[PDB]
Write a protein that binds this ligand. Structure first.
Ligand SMILES: O=C(O)CNC(=O)C(=O)O
Ligand SMILES: [Mg+2]
Ligand code: NI
Ligand SMILES: [Zn+2]
Length: 331
């Protein structure tokens, strides 16, 4: 068995290897990358996502989200308070203000210590989930707006044509902006490209050990667990590395820098935080190996998780027993 310790693997494809996305995902899996739940892909030196980032300031963040925490420093939830619209240029200036900027630090490890110590005492503002792309249309390799769609994959694997579309999303971050512990919708893959700015630190639990994280989460968030049988679908709970280590939960960590891709694998729980002003782009995708994970994915039916239009068909076809109750949650 390749990568039996479930370490995060880092890949350096050549420009030739960067041509065929599906093939390269399958290669990484042949080497055991999926066992970690997360992999890093450093693009060939010849590749670029676009020529420059000099003209992005007029992108609108229609609903910036202030991420307000409740709890203790290593075990907290966050809720999102909607703020007034602002441009990327306005948001960048806000991120660099004295109130929100990254503090002085020695190295990524020191910054990580400061994040876990101090996150809860601040409410950073995240520009998340903005439909769009920063890849140039002429970028032919690993262009996250030109991937094969999940609907086409389901149709190729299973023979059933379904409605829905699959487009990318932009994320504009600042110091302390936080992504809570989650797997993807329908336990899909994700791919995330850090276009510019400061790093993003990731934490991940191997897919084979996901249920250990879920059990800890039920213990640590006992009211939320009674409210919903899949409350991590709400994407609000944070648990620190120290708390995970105290409770014996297997996990790994890695920092993504600008110009790097990260891939999350089916049922790989992940969480993390941004180091400072940055912009990332991410999208879900599927491969043949996903189908079995899609069929078994948990679902929120309490009504809180509320997701995209395209998830309907995935539930309806892969999880027909659950369909009824899940759709009651969505309506
Ligand atoms: O970058 C973020 O805020 C969160 N991204 C992801 O969870 C992802 O790419 O799957
Ligand atoms: Mg612009
Ligand atoms: Ni994710
Ligand atoms: Zn729920």
């Amino acid at each position: 068995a390749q990568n039996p310790n479930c370490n995060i693997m880092i890949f350096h494809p050549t420009k030739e290897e960067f041509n065929d996305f599906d093939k390269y995902i399958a290669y990484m899996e042949s080497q055991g990358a999926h066992r970690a739940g997360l992999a890093k892909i450093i693009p060939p030196k010849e590749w670029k996502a676009r020529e420059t980032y000099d003209n992005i300031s007029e992108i609108l963040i229609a609903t910036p989200l202030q991420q307000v925490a409740s709890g203790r420093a290593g075990v907290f939830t966050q809720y999102h308070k909607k703020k007034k619209a602002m441009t990327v240029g306005e948001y960048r200036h806000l991120a660099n203000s004295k109130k929100y900027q990254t503090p002085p630090h020695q190295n990524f490890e020191d910054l990580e210590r400061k994040y876990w110590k101090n996150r809860i005492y601040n409410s950073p503002i995240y520009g998340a989930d903005i439909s769009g792309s920063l890849f140039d249309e002429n970028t032919k390799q690993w262009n996250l707006g030109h991937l094969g769609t999940i609907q086409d994959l389901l149709e190729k694997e299973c023979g059933v044509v379904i409605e829905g579309v699959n487009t990318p999303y932009l994320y504009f971050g600042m110091w302390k902006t936080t992504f809570a512990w989650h797997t993807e919708d329908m336990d899909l893959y994700s791919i995330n490209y850090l276009h510019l700015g400061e790093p993003k630190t990731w934490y991940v639990v191997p897919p084979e050990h996901g249920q250990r994280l879920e059990r800890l989460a039920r213990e640590l968030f006992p009211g939320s667990s009674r409210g919903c049988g899949a409350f991590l679908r709400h994407k609000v709970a944070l648990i620190s590395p120290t708390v995970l280590k105290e409770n014996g939960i297997p996990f790994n960590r890695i920092t993504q820098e600008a110009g790097e891709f990260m891939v999350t694998f089916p049922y790989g729980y992940h969480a993390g935080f941004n180091h400072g002003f940055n912009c990332a782009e991410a999208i879900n995708f599927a491969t043949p190996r996903w189908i079995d994970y899609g069929k078994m994915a948990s679902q929120c039916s309490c009504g809180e998780a509320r997701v995209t239009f395209s998830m309907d068909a995935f539930v309806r076809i892969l999880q027909p027993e659950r369909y009824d109750l899940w759709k009651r949650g969505q309506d």
